[PDB]
Structure formats: C-alpha cells, structure tokens
Design a protein around this nucleic acid. Structure first.
Lengths: 199, 89, 86
RNA sequence: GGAGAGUUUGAUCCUGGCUCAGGACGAACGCUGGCGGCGUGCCUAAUACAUGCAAGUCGAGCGGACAGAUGGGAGCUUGCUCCCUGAUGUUAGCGGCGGACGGGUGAGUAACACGUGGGUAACCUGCCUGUAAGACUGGGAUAACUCCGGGAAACCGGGGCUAAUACCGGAUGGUUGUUUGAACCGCAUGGUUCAAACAUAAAAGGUGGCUUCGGCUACCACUUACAGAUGGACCCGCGGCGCAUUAGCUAGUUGGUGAGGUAACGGCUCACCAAGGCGACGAUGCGUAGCCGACCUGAGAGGGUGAUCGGCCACACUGGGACUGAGACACGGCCCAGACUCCUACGGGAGGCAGCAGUAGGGAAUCUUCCGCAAUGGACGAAAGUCUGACGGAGCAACGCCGCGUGAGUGAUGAAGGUUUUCGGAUCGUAAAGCUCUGUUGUUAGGGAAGAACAAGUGCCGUUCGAAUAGGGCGGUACCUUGACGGUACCUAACCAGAAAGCCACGGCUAACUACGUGCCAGCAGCCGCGGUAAUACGUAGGUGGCAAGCGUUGUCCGGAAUUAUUGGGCGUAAAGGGCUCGCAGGCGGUUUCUUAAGUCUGAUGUGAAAGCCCCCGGCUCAACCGGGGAGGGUCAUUGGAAACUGGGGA
C-alpha cells in the first residue's frame, strides 16, 4: 500500500523535484533530513542505482514487488530495454488517468481512479494498477461525473499527451498508441533502471 | 468400454470440462485415450467446440458419452450426424 | 470388520467347494485316462481318451481351465494316447 | 544473455582459500498483523490408535415374509375388531455384477523397477462396438423356511420343505484340441488358408405389448466364432549413484536333453549329462534411494529435489499362503504364524486410520471429529433411484503468489512538543492544524437468488424392428422441474476519515547519522572487526534508508565459485612431473587413389501423453489464475541421400 509517504522530502532527497512541476521544495533546494543542509556527495554504482530505481520508481510510487514485475515484465516485450520499461511503467491506468487531465495530484488522481469513480472502457476499472491498451475509451464514469475534482481539473490546464487524447465535455478519452517513448523526456534515465535493478 | 466423458479442469471458483476420450475406469483428472474437445460450463454460457472428424471415429469405434457428453455431442451436431453415419446401416 | 461381501466370503466358500469338485474331478479323470495310457490297452485307450476329453472340455469350458492350458493338457494326452494306439 | 567487493603485506603483485551481496521452499522461529482471489499445509515415528462415514446395488432373476387400498362374511360400538382375497409398498436370504477402479504412503528395490525405443510366427482381455450363427430336450439339489440341539458371545450342528438368471446329464455346434490331403508365404523355431473323422455350451430367461391362448413379437439379457477397442503380462537396445580402505563371485550356477508347469518362451521347477558362466567396459559386496513428466537455480553447460497435479512400480500391523474370479496373491476379502490391544461364563472369540477427519506420541514443524450428490467421473441398474470422506464445496493458518487499501486536494499560521545547536538557530515539515472532497474494504439496508443447469421424464416427427395402425430401439424438435455452496459473488443507496503499519538497517561490503549513558564492563558480529570516559559499530532517543501486510534470523539447494576448468584452470620457484625404463591392453597417427556408410551431415514418417517453461490471443474489473492456439525437447527407431574428414577393405 504505497500511499504513505510525506510527498515533500521524498522528492526532496529523491533526486529531482517531480511532480511537480514546481513542488520540488523551491524554498529549500537541499535534501530533506536532520543532517541534510550540509554538503552532499555522490554515491557508488549503487548510488546511481538507488537514485535511478528510487527516482524512476518514485514518479509512480508502486511497491518494489509490482515495480520489479514491471521490470522483468517490461523486459519481456519487444524493442529496447529502458524504452519498454518506460512506456510500461507510465502507461498505467492511474498514469493514464492523471495524465489525461483528470486530477491535479498523482495520489489524488490515483484514488480518483481506484475510488470506483473513473470507470473506463465503458465499465468500471477499480484497480489502480489495472491499465488499458492503446484504444480503450478511458472514460469518466458519468454516474458521479458532476464533481468538484473532475470539474476543477477540467478547468486547470496542462500539456496533454499526444499518445493520449482528452475529452472535457463528451466524457470520454483514448490513447492513440504507445506514448512518446524517448519523447516523454523527464529526468528519469532508464540506464539506471538497466543497472540498479539488473544483477 | 472407453466411455468418452468429461474431465474437470480450471480454477476452484469455476470448473470447465475439456472432455477427452478416456479409458474404461481411469482416474478423473488422469489418463485419457486421445483428447478431442474443450467445453467450459460458463462463459457465456456453454460455448464449446468438439472435433467431429476424429470424434466420429471415437464415437463409432466403440464408445459412448456421459450425460453431459451425450447432451453436448448431441448439441454440436455430432451424435445425430453420426446417427446418419449409422443411417447407412 | 467386513462391511459388505461377508456373504461374498460364504459364496467364496461354497463356490470354492463346487469348483474344487469339478476341477479335482478333471485332474483325477486326467490321471485316469493317463493311467489307461500307462498300459498297452487299445479300447480303453480310445474310450478313456473320450472320457478325459469330455471331462477335460467340460472342465475348461466353465471356470478354471481355461483355454491354452487345456489345449496343452489335451495335446500331450492326445500325443501319448495316439502313441500307445497309433 | 553473464557486474563483484572484503580479507594474508610496513607497502606491492600473484597464488590460494574463507565470507557477503541474488534467487528459491511443503519451512520454522522472532516482532507485528486490514481484506479479497488463486494454489499450499505430518517432510520427524510406514508410531499406536477412541469415536463417526468411507461399496454397494439388482423386486424388470428368485422362493418367501410382513403390511395393505378395495371387496367379502361375523360379533356389537352403530364402529369396530375376528377370519379370507387383493392393487400396492418394504426388506432377510439365494443368485449376477461391482469390492483388482477410485483413495492413501514411499516402507522397500540400485534392476527390466522407471524413462525411452523396438519386438511378441512366445501372451492373454470380463464389461463395451460391429458381424453372424444359435438358443432343443431333461434332471436332482440347497440356502431361506421351520423342529430339536451345543455354545457366554462369536457362533456352529443335525432332521424335514422350495425356487430361480443356482448347479448338472444328453443332442447340436468346427471354428476348441488329435490324425491326414493340400495350397501360399516366411526369421531357425515355422506362420496363413482349405477339406475329413473324436470330443466341448445355451437364462425354454425376465420385462412388456399383442394373440386364435397354440403362440407371436420388441427391449434388457445367455452362449459360441470373429475382428475392433481398452487394458495389463513378457523379452531386448540405450540412459540415470557414493565406494576398491569391496577382486573375486557363482553350483539351478553356465549350457545341453527329457518331463512337468503357467496365458507364455525360459533352469520357471525337477531327473539325467557336461564344466561352464560374470568381471577393470567394475562382477559381487557395503551404502543410499521410489523412478519419470518435471521443479528450483545458472548466461549457458551444468548443480540440486522428486512436495502439491499426472504416469508407472511397490506396500497395506509383520511375515507366508492360496481361494473366488476375466483380472488379485487382493488397502476397509479369507487361512496360518508372530507382535500389540479389547471381550471372556477361561472353553474361546474380536481388530487393522500408509481412506476422510480426529486423539496421544514424536518434533522447530503442519489444520475442521463440517455441507451435498447441484456438476464431472464411478458402481449397480430396464429406467426412477441408491451408495460415492472421489469429487464439488466449505471452516482454520500471512503458508506461498497476486491485486486493492489504511486516505486525497489545498494549506507557511514554516503551530506546540521531540532532536540538534557555535544558542542566531536547524529537523520532523505541506507535515500537523485547518477549508473542501472521495468510500476501496468497512457499517447499515435493499436488490440478486447471477453464472455454475446439463440431464431424466411428457408429446410429436423421420427411420428401424415387428403378422401388426400395438409396443420398442435409433436420431431430431418443444414442455416441466433439479444450487450444497448461498442470501455467495457482484450491483445500488446512505453513513462516517472514522476502525486499517509495522520490521530491519544507518563504518565498509551496502541505501541510511548525530546526541546521552556505558568505559575491554554490559555487549555486537555474516567477514573486516569495534568497546580500556569525545564510540558515525554497545543500549537508549531524534532523524535517515531499504521494504511493506509484511520485515529480519536460521536450516537446505543453486549462483558468485574460471574455487573440478568439455565450454573454461594448471604443474621451474606458489599445491602439482611418476626416481627411471620396458612393455600388454587401451588412446592417437605420414601422402596418392577405388569402394563403404560404421561414425559425420541432411531430407520423410513414427514417437517423445497431458499439465508445466517460452511465443500468440481470449475469459475472471486488471493481476495471480484459467482456457485456446502454437513452439522446443531424443548418440530414439524405420528409411532416402552427400563421401569432404575418422574408420573398414584393396592397390
């Protein structure tokens, strides 16, 4: 059950301020902790290993079991290693939910996706890690669509993905293909997931 | 003789037969003669496709169904059409 | 504490008695036609061959014979009986 | 598709071990502990067992026996009993089938036991297909039933009576054996097919329906002959294990002939004869062990285990034995002996949880003495049905795997408190407060009796049988019901953030740091090693880090381990050249040329079952999981090619 962290110091010492995209601790850019204001140093190969695995895994927030099974399960696909892991670990039902302009928080859109509300493909999708392939109508679950969170997130703007496609009035959605695999260009470098989780 | 009858398989919530031809008195989930068929009880509902090109050789080569094997192979047009095989008697 | 087929036990006793009567009658008849083939007796050789033949097939044709062992016994007895009489 | 690091030195490199990071369980223990789905749970003592259910069924085989609608006559009660007939229902015994399948456990066994691949002119097969003949004439029994008896019981005995689908004569039948005449073909044995003499069976059954009451006919039966199918039996090639501090072994042994035996060859067992046979290519002997599909691990080669599901073998308290049967040497069948328990009228009897639970023991270690034939498979049936601790389910255990949650948005008022502080301050920290939202699971109340449900029975149609428009088989169409789980899953409404987070680590390997106390004391520790008053290592407190309804410790297996090395190590000095030679077996070999296919390589068929690993889809809200569609796996057989190379042969 991932929903336990603070959500300030986890990004604050996790390596990069996301997400975001301003909630990175701009008041104190150092790492969080009692011995944290001082000079930071680099790690070993396990330093970039833990920063790559904890950094790229903290963007979604799953447990190490499901994230590991997405590591080898992502490596079971075709293409390249870090690209398949990158399109897999971000094409989830909650990343497709909060990436479609659904909710203004990754945990908030997560609980909006597994709260029974955001039912997609015409039916309900009640598991926050139960994704949808390219072409499923990632809907809004119109029996409770008149809400404050959905209307406010429909009022708040954001750069919608070109792998996906939104709907603010028709109450629908879609994912046109796999997302822009190298195109989705955060700081999460997939080589550290090819090294700090490969042994 | 070899009574071509059902055989359980699947999860503990829902069983779906895959009725291969079997011996006289083999174990239930055990040895079978030469497997031909698959027909779940549920989903949606009772959709199962049988052989009828070797299953006519099984039902004609000395055999018989069970209750559910007889209703299934009489539903898929194989017991009656086999009877039209015997209709040239 | 035998639940069912204790009466199978009693049926095994009575069936064992009647079956021992027929089978032991077959063995004693086979030694009888073999004894008649012991000496150089012509008419007792053929009629006694008919005796061990009829009792032989009547024993092997129901119960404990059954087929191939009866053909072995009647075959060797036919060889001796055909030897002593031509 | 493969990652290394520490540790010998004053420093260095080699060589060399030793440990750690990773995965895994049928785990257990330590701390803690919300739920759902799917699998798992005596591995130690095959230890002994209380108690309940685990195999019954056939009235459409049989002769009863009881009750009894309905009817009959009596006495009284104006409603009853007494004696008869009888639809009807029930069952104790006879007989047929089923207890050899199913279920459990690895005790045995190092070979035909398993896996694979052949073979069987060396086997058998009840039930079931399909074919075609038959079902003729008779007999005397016997349990039941009673009358006596002996027994504590368990139980036996004896006298009278009866029947069948019980048994037993005769005809008929070849095919089933023996003799002859052949004909065709093989693998020594010989096989296939044709004819002619001696022997070998039948439920006249039952069910209905019809009829002239002589008999007719259908269905379920009985026998015989054939092939089919399913099963097992046998023989053989090859494969899978620690030991030479096991080199001898073997006398029914090695082989012959003859006889007997079983379904069958065979020293399988015997008589007689001969003196053989196995062994360094490991005999025998000790040890250990069920084997395989497979599982776990590895980049791969390999290494380890044989749980759960399946296939075969074995065993059924220990050790023998045989009967019934088609088939057992029989798990809830018998006979004997031994052990252990129970009963005893001391004369004698009774038992087998390595079936489902369950109790005691053992141990670190493993659960409910539950529901039902609704499904599937069985058994018996003409069917209706009955049995089914198989199974379908359930109950417990975080035991494993997977999924979801214990909130979310906002929030600088950077709150109080805790830790730190050169005493200005820093940290828990958008964290909390707070404004607002959501209900996953909860809690309540309804829906829903969702699927899992198909059958069997009732018409009617085509077609078969039928002397028959009866009646039936066969095959279609339509009606009625049948849910243990289960008021389960899931859906809907409301309610409340309310009930839902811990374990280990913070020098290195290795993510994670400071203070107090302790002062070689108490302690830690996987290795390196710390601790003798400033401890980033001992406890305590704040904070950090890993992980998560889980987290560490330990046990075992794999890898790291290029630290058994075929891939892929070496031997001058590190461990390692035999002191040296001669030689048998073995291992390897100059150049040209013809053949060969024994190796080498390639094509076609068979077979390597399913489930599992991988690829491609679909179904449970996704996933774990299930199902479908594929693949791959062999010194494998049978068979066709190439002849370059090793070999055979010749020059």
């Amino acid at each position: 059950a991932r929903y336990t962290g603070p959500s300030w110091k986890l990004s604050r010492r996790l390596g990069i301020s996301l997400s975001g995209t301003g909630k990175e601790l701009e008041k104190r850019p150092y790492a969080p902790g009692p011995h944290g204001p001082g000079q930071r140093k680099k790690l070993s190969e396990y330093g970039l290993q833990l920063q790559e695995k904890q950094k790229l895994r903290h963007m979604y927030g799953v447990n190490e079991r499901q994230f590991r099974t997405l590591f080898d399960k992502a490596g079971k696909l075709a293409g390249k290693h870090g690209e398949n892991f990158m399109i897999l670990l971000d094409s989830r039902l909650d990343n497709v939910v909060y990436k479609l302009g659904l909710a203004r928080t990754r945990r908030q859109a997560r609980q909006l996706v597994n709260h029974g509300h955001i039912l997609v493909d015409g039916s309900r999708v009640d598991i926050p890690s139960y994704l949808v392939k390219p072409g499923q109508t990632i809907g809004v679950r119109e029996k409770s669509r008149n809400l404050s969170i959905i209307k406010e997130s429909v009022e708040v703007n954001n750069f919608v993905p070109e792998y996906l496609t939104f709907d603010a009035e028709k109450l629908e959605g879609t994912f046109t293909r796999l997302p822009e695999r190298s195109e989705l260009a955060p700081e999460i470098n997939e080589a550290l997931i090819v090294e700090f989780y490969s042994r | 003789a070899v009574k071509i009858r059902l055989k359980r398989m699947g999860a503990k919530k829902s069983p779906f037969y895959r009725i291969v031809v079997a011996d006289s008195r083999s174990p239930r989930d055990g040895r079978f003669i030469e497997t031909v068929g698959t027909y779940n009880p549920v989903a949606k509902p009772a959709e199962v496709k049988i052989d009828e090109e070797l299953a006519l050789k099984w039902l004609q080569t000395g055999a018989k169904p069970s209750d559910t094997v007889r209703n299934l192979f009489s539903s898929q047009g194989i017991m009656e059409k086999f009877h039209n095989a015997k209709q040239g008697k | 504490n035998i639940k069912s087929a204790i009466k199978r036990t009693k049926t095994n006793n009575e069936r064992r008695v009647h079956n021992a009567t027929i089978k032991s009658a077959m063995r004693t008849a086979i030694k009888q036609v073999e004894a008649s083939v012991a000496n150089n007796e012509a008419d007792k050789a053929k009629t006694a061959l008919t005796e061990a033949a009829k009792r032989i097939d009547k024993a092997v044709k129901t119960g404990l014979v059954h087929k191939n062992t009866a053909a072995r016994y009647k075959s060797r007895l036919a060889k001796k009986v055909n030897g002593l009489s031509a």
